[PDB]
Symmetry: C2
Subunit: 41 residues, 2 copies
């Protein structure tokens, strides 16, 4: 059970960290093009 929990925790942590990185990158895209549109306006 312990090894199964280690595997599942590793998978969940990797998925969550990838979701953090996804949110941060898409927010960076957002801030960049938000600066672009704000500059154009």
């Amino acid at each position: 059970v312990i090894r199964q929990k280690e595997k599942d925790l590793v998978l969940a942590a990797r998925l969550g960290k990838a979701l953090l990185e996804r949110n941060q990158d898409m927010s960076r895209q957002y801030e960049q093009m938000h600066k672009e549109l704000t500059d154009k306006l």
Copy 2:
């Protein structure tokens, strides 16, 4: 040891859920403001 890993698994699952819903909501907000700013431009 088992309880700590189970807690970490629950935390990772909740983190993934909250970040996936956050991803949907932030994408929605972003799409909305892109359309709005383009209209203003």
